Amino acid sequence: HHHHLVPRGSNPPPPETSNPNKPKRQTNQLQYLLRVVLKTLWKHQFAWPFQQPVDAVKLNLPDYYKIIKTPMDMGTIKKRLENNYYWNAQECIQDFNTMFTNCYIYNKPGDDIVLMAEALEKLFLQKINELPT
Ligand SMILES: CCN1C(=O)Cc2cc(NS(=O)(=O)C3CCCCC3)ccc21
């Protein structure tokens, strides 16, 4: 709206969460990623800002998508795991890493959201360290 004084930043469509063209392939590592890693992060007191795609309009981050080219969030990851979108653990780990990276490159060091990301990432990496073979 020309009426706006403060810029608004529009949102992309959210990331895809299923892929009709891949077989339904379950592994112990993917089960662990959903049921141990994602679940432990999801229930953490700092998870809530990470649980859905960044809404740059509702959160007043009008420059978010200028800075972040590959958005990712734990809601998308959770859905991708539940839908068997991933071929392997590495692909899921990549999406968690993207989510954390986005936070670290958009927000200033020391920002509260960065401190939250750091606590979550520590837990994530602890859990990853115990990935079943
Ligand atoms: C994690 C995604 N993210 C950012 O990178 C910056 C940001 C800001 C907010 N805004 S918010 O929910 O009003 C709250 C989030 C906790 C820090 C203070 C601001 C939510 C998510 C994100």
Side-chain angles (χ1 to χ4, degrees):
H1 290 116
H2 161 106
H3 100 66
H4 292 327
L5 313 170
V6 173
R8 268 59 167 192
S10 66
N11 297 304
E16 308 288 32
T17 56
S18 65
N19 173 9
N21 290 352
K22 85 167 273 295
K24 312 187 283 253
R25 246 67 162 102
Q26 194 77 87
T27 75
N28 290 310
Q29 288 179 354
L30 291 168
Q31 288 279 204
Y32 181 91
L33 276 154
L34 177 57
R35 296 175 180 272
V36 176
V37 180
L38 184 278
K39 186 185 275 279
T40 301
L41 287 196
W42 190 271
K43 302 173 326 193
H44 194 282
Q45 62 175 319
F46 297 161
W48 65 276
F50 300 90
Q51 284 175 331
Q52 51 286 317
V54 167
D55 184 337
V57 178
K58 174 134 254 188
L59 298 178
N60 186 26
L61 309 169
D63 57 340
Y64 187 81
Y65 293 111
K66 294 163 177 67
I67 296 159
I68 299 306
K69 49 257 286 166
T70 305
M72 188 55 51
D73 66 277
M74 290 213 293
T76 296
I77 291 170
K78 185 175 186 277
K79 293 173 184 187
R80 283 176 172 195
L81 285 160
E82 289 163 347
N83 305 347
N84 201 241
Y85 179 89
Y86 298 117
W87 294 98
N88 59 45
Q90 298 98 288
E91 282 188 335
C92 177
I93 294 169
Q94 179 166 264
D95 280 354
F96 278 107
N97 288 330
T98 298
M99 177 184 79
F100 288 125
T101 295
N102 292 343
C103 186
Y104 296 142
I105 72 182
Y106 176 76
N107 303 278
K108 305 286 189 191
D111 278 5
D112 280 56
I113 192 71
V114 172
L115 305 180
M116 295 170 70
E118 287 177 9
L120 295 169
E121 187 185 24
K122 172 171 298 93
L123 245 186
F124 167 68
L125 297 171
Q126 288 170 335
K127 295 306 177 184
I128 289 311
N129 288 343
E130 302 178 311
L131 202 60
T133 52

